[PDB]
DNA sequence: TTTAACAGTTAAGAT
DNA sequence: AAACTTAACTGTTAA
């Protein structure tokens, strides 16, 4: 078990992958029902979970949109006009009108 | 500056 | 592991 760095267990059936919090740029809802996609530095992991629970895990995980939970540690910049959040790995996600200012 | 109506869309709670 | 339901979202628009 990785005890020295905060980690989240992402499950796939009886398989588990432990991912360090700051490996994660953001989570988004999957096109697949009841699944989410964790966007890591250079990998994506699809798993069963809910965005609400993830946002409750840690102050750094913020619900910036109904469909997205961002890791504040990995935000590089925000285009506030278009409400696009940019991450250190060059990915982006969207923030909602009601949540963008609270990031 | 603020809140929210509107109407379409979606996250998440039996088999 | 992977259909049906509806509260609560969404951006636009207005006040
Ligand atoms: Mg890292
Ligand atoms: Mg949080």
PDB file of C-alpha atoms (C1' of nucleotides) and ligand atoms in Angstrom:
ATOM      1  CA  UNK A   1       0.000   0.000   0.000  1.00  0.00           C
ATOM      2  CA  UNK A   2       1.221   3.507  -0.889  1.00  0.00           C
ATOM      3  CA  UNK A   3       0.932   5.311   2.452  1.00  0.00           C
ATOM      4  CA  UNK A   4       3.266   8.268   1.853  1.00  0.00           C
ATOM      5  CA  UNK A   5       1.189   9.930  -0.887  1.00  0.00           C
ATOM      6  CA  UNK A   6      -2.606  10.236  -0.930  1.00  0.00           C
ATOM      7  CA  UNK A   7      -4.176   7.682  -3.237  1.00  0.00           C
ATOM      8  CA  UNK A   8      -7.568   6.688  -4.595  1.00  0.00           C
ATOM      9  CA  UNK A   9      -8.523   3.124  -5.472  1.00  0.00           C
ATOM     10  CA  UNK A  10     -10.118   2.876  -8.912  1.00  0.00           C
ATOM     11  CA  UNK A  11     -11.744  -0.529  -9.379  1.00  0.00           C
ATOM     12  CA  UNK A  12     -12.476  -2.625 -12.457  1.00  0.00           C
ATOM     13  CA  UNK A  13     -14.347  -5.770 -11.502  1.00  0.00           C
ATOM     14  CA  UNK A  14     -12.058  -7.472  -8.987  1.00  0.00           C
ATOM     15  CA  UNK A  15      -9.016  -5.531 -10.251  1.00  0.00           C
ATOM     16  CA  UNK A  16      -7.844  -2.370  -8.526  1.00  0.00           C
ATOM     17  CA  UNK A  17      -5.482   0.390  -9.536  1.00  0.00           C
ATOM     18  CA  UNK A  18      -4.286   2.823  -6.898  1.00  0.00           C
ATOM     19  CA  UNK A  19      -3.716   6.283  -8.298  1.00  0.00           C
ATOM     20  CA  UNK A  20      -2.049   9.168  -6.482  1.00  0.00           C
ATOM     21  CA  UNK A  21      -4.381  12.164  -6.128  1.00  0.00           C
ATOM     22  CA  UNK A  22      -2.113  14.526  -8.055  1.00  0.00           C
ATOM     23  CA  UNK A  23      -1.709  12.036 -10.915  1.00  0.00           C
ATOM     24  CA  UNK A  24      -5.304  13.084 -11.654  1.00  0.00           C
ATOM     25  CA  UNK A  25      -6.105  16.203 -13.673  1.00  0.00           C
ATOM     26  CA  UNK A  26      -9.894  15.842 -13.511  1.00  0.00           C
ATOM     27  CA  UNK A  27     -12.739  13.334 -13.502  1.00  0.00           C
ATOM     28  CA  UNK A  28     -15.592  13.475 -16.010  1.00  0.00           C
ATOM     29  CA  UNK A  29     -18.772  11.520 -16.544  1.00  0.00           C
ATOM     30  CA  UNK A  30     -18.343   8.717 -19.081  1.00  0.00           C
ATOM     31  CA  UNK A  31     -20.630   8.171 -22.061  1.00  0.00           C
ATOM     32  CA  UNK A  32     -21.096   4.782 -20.347  1.00  0.00           C
ATOM     33  CA  UNK A  33     -23.868   4.909 -17.723  1.00  0.00           C
ATOM     34  CA  UNK A  34     -22.714   5.155 -14.073  1.00  0.00           C
ATOM     35  CA  UNK A  35     -19.045   5.322 -15.055  1.00  0.00           C
ATOM     36  CA  UNK A  36     -16.497   8.104 -14.838  1.00  0.00           C
ATOM     37  CA  UNK A  37     -13.191   8.739 -16.554  1.00  0.00           C
ATOM     38  CA  UNK A  38     -10.179   9.795 -14.475  1.00  0.00           C
ATOM     39  CA  UNK A  39      -7.865  11.879 -16.660  1.00  0.00           C
ATOM     40  CA  UNK A  40      -4.308  11.285 -15.441  1.00  0.00           C
ATOM     41  CA  UNK A  41      -1.033  12.796 -16.671  1.00  0.00           C
ATOM     42  CA  UNK A  42      -0.856  10.516 -19.741  1.00  0.00           C
ATOM     43  CA  UNK A  43      -3.570   7.901 -19.140  1.00  0.00           C
ATOM     44  CA  UNK A  44      -7.329   7.674 -18.707  1.00  0.00           C
ATOM     45  CA  UNK A  45      -9.065   5.221 -16.411  1.00  0.00           C
ATOM     46  CA  UNK A  46     -12.750   4.369 -16.650  1.00  0.00           C
ATOM     47  CA  UNK A  47     -14.448   3.159 -13.485  1.00  0.00           C
ATOM     48  CA  UNK A  48     -17.746   2.987 -11.615  1.00  0.00           C
ATOM     49  CA  UNK A  49     -18.217   5.936  -9.270  1.00  0.00           C
ATOM     50  CA  UNK A  50     -19.976   9.223  -8.734  1.00  0.00           C
ATOM     51  CA  UNK A  51     -18.704  12.782  -8.972  1.00  0.00           C
ATOM     52  CA  UNK A  52     -20.347  13.856  -5.718  1.00  0.00           C
ATOM     53  CA  UNK A  53     -18.394  11.305  -3.663  1.00  0.00           C
ATOM     54  CA  UNK A  54     -15.122  12.306  -5.335  1.00  0.00           C
ATOM     55  CA  UNK A  55     -15.701  15.992  -4.590  1.00  0.00           C
ATOM     56  CA  UNK A  56     -16.256  15.034  -0.917  1.00  0.00           C
ATOM     57  CA  UNK A  57     -12.930  13.172  -0.748  1.00  0.00           C
ATOM     58  CA  UNK A  58     -10.606  16.163  -0.532  1.00  0.00           C
ATOM     59  CA  UNK A  59     -10.704  19.949  -0.721  1.00  0.00           C
ATOM     60  CA  UNK A  60      -8.603  19.809  -3.904  1.00  0.00           C
ATOM     61  CA  UNK A  61     -11.329  17.920  -5.787  1.00  0.00           C
ATOM     62  CA  UNK A  62     -13.852  20.570  -6.813  1.00  0.00           C
ATOM     63  CA  UNK A  63     -17.156  20.180  -8.672  1.00  0.00           C
ATOM     64  CA  UNK A  64     -16.634  22.846 -11.365  1.00  0.00           C
ATOM     65  CA  UNK A  65     -19.546  21.554 -13.497  1.00  0.00           C
ATOM     66  CA  UNK A  66     -22.287  18.976 -13.171  1.00  0.00           C
ATOM     67  CA  UNK A  67     -20.147  16.672 -15.383  1.00  0.00           C
ATOM     68  CA  UNK A  68     -16.630  17.469 -14.047  1.00  0.00           C
ATOM     69  CA  UNK A  69     -14.587  17.330 -10.827  1.00  0.00           C
ATOM     70  CA  UNK A  70     -11.226  19.086 -11.139  1.00  0.00           C
ATOM     71  CA  UNK A  71      -8.054  18.602  -9.160  1.00  0.00           C
ATOM     72  CA  UNK A  72      -7.162  22.154  -8.136  1.00  0.00           C
ATOM     73  CA  UNK A  73      -3.493  21.113  -7.710  1.00  0.00           C
ATOM     74  CA  UNK A  74      -3.234  20.428 -11.424  1.00  0.00           C
ATOM     75  CA  UNK A  75      -4.991  23.438 -12.884  1.00  0.00           C
ATOM     76  CA  UNK A  76      -2.595  25.517 -14.952  1.00  0.00           C
ATOM     77  CA  UNK A  77      -4.960  28.316 -16.003  1.00  0.00           C
ATOM     78  CA  UNK A  78      -8.607  29.092 -16.609  1.00  0.00           C
ATOM     79  CA  UNK A  79     -10.196  30.812 -19.585  1.00  0.00           C
ATOM     80  CA  UNK A  80     -12.973  32.443 -17.531  1.00  0.00           C
ATOM     81  CA  UNK A  81     -14.736  33.965 -20.560  1.00  0.00           C
ATOM     82  CA  UNK A  82     -15.246  30.553 -22.201  1.00  0.00           C
ATOM     83  CA  UNK A  83     -15.214  28.760 -18.831  1.00  0.00           C
ATOM     84  CA  UNK A  84     -12.506  26.280 -19.857  1.00  0.00           C
ATOM     85  CA  UNK A  85     -10.108  24.845 -17.272  1.00  0.00           C
ATOM     86  CA  UNK A  86      -6.589  24.005 -18.509  1.00  0.00           C
ATOM     87  CA  UNK A  87      -4.395  21.437 -16.831  1.00  0.00           C
ATOM     88  CA  UNK A  88      -0.646  21.044 -16.524  1.00  0.00           C
ATOM     89  CA  UNK A  89      -0.779  18.152 -19.053  1.00  0.00           C
ATOM     90  CA  UNK A  90      -2.524  20.346 -21.703  1.00  0.00           C
ATOM     91  CA  UNK A  91      -5.939  18.750 -21.343  1.00  0.00           C
ATOM     92  CA  UNK A  92      -8.980  20.858 -20.584  1.00  0.00           C
ATOM     93  CA  UNK A  93     -12.478  20.526 -19.197  1.00  0.00           C
ATOM     94  CA  UNK A  94     -15.489  22.768 -18.753  1.00  0.00           C
ATOM     95  CA  UNK A  95     -16.777  24.815 -15.856  1.00  0.00           C
ATOM     96  CA  UNK A  96     -20.412  25.819 -15.456  1.00  0.00           C
ATOM     97  CA  UNK A  97     -21.698  29.396 -15.187  1.00  0.00           C
ATOM     98  CA  UNK A  98     -22.674  28.821 -11.544  1.00  0.00           C
ATOM     99  CA  UNK A  99     -19.419  27.142 -10.422  1.00  0.00           C
ATOM    100  CA  UNK A 100     -16.553  28.675 -12.441  1.00  0.00           C
ATOM    101  CA  UNK A 101     -15.905  31.617 -10.093  1.00  0.00           C
ATOM    102  CA  UNK A 102     -15.542  29.298  -7.087  1.00  0.00           C
ATOM    103  CA  UNK A 103     -12.669  27.230  -8.531  1.00  0.00           C
TER     104      UNK A 103
ATOM    105  C1'  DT B   1     -23.829  43.863  -8.690  1.00  0.00           C
ATOM    106  C1'  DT B   2     -27.929  40.200  -7.622  1.00  0.00           C
ATOM    107  C1'  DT B   3     -31.464  36.042  -8.319  1.00  0.00           C
ATOM    108  C1'  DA B   4     -33.978  33.190 -11.070  1.00  0.00           C
ATOM    109  C1'  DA B   5     -37.566  31.574 -15.179  1.00  0.00           C
ATOM    110  C1'  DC B   6     -37.266  28.727 -18.902  1.00  0.00           C
ATOM    111  C1'  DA B   7     -36.869  24.428 -21.118  1.00  0.00           C
ATOM    112  C1'  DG B   8     -33.588  20.984 -22.482  1.00  0.00           C
ATOM    113  C1'  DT B   9     -30.112  17.700 -20.490  1.00  0.00           C
ATOM    114  C1'  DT B  10     -27.909  14.540 -17.106  1.00  0.00           C
ATOM    115  C1'  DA B  11     -25.962  12.240 -12.643  1.00  0.00           C
ATOM    116  C1'  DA B  12     -26.976   8.942 -10.003  1.00  0.00           C
ATOM    117  C1'  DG B  13     -30.574   6.139  -7.196  1.00  0.00           C
ATOM    118  C1'  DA B  14     -34.320  -2.656 -10.105  1.00  0.00           C
ATOM    119  C1'  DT B  15     -32.663  -6.586 -12.271  1.00  0.00           C
TER     120       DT B  15
ATOM    121  C1'  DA C   1     -21.268  -6.045 -13.850  1.00  0.00           C
ATOM    122  C1'  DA C   2     -24.101  -3.240 -16.854  1.00  0.00           C
ATOM    123  C1'  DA C   3     -33.378   0.019 -18.021  1.00  0.00           C
ATOM    124  C1'  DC C   4     -36.139   3.191 -15.844  1.00  0.00           C
ATOM    125  C1'  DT C   5     -36.514   7.334 -13.185  1.00  0.00           C
ATOM    126  C1'  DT C   6     -36.374  12.283 -11.706  1.00  0.00           C
ATOM    127  C1'  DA C   7     -34.143  16.049  -8.911  1.00  0.00           C
ATOM    128  C1'  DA C   8     -31.122  19.042 -10.032  1.00  0.00           C
ATOM    129  C1'  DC C   9     -28.364  20.429 -13.218  1.00  0.00           C
ATOM    130  C1'  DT C  10     -27.380  23.445 -17.772  1.00  0.00           C
ATOM    131  C1'  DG C  11     -26.676  28.184 -20.710  1.00  0.00           C
ATOM    132  C1'  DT C  12     -29.442  31.859 -22.097  1.00  0.00           C
ATOM    133  C1'  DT C  13     -32.093  35.524 -21.064  1.00  0.00           C
ATOM    134  C1'  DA C  14     -34.424  38.618 -18.292  1.00  0.00           C
ATOM    135  C1'  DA C  15     -35.447  41.549 -14.532  1.00  0.00           C
TER     136       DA C  15
HETATM  137 MG1  LIG D   1       2.740  13.848 -10.742  1.00  0.00          MG
HETATM  138 MG1  LIG D   2     -13.869  18.909  -2.547  1.00  0.00          MG
END
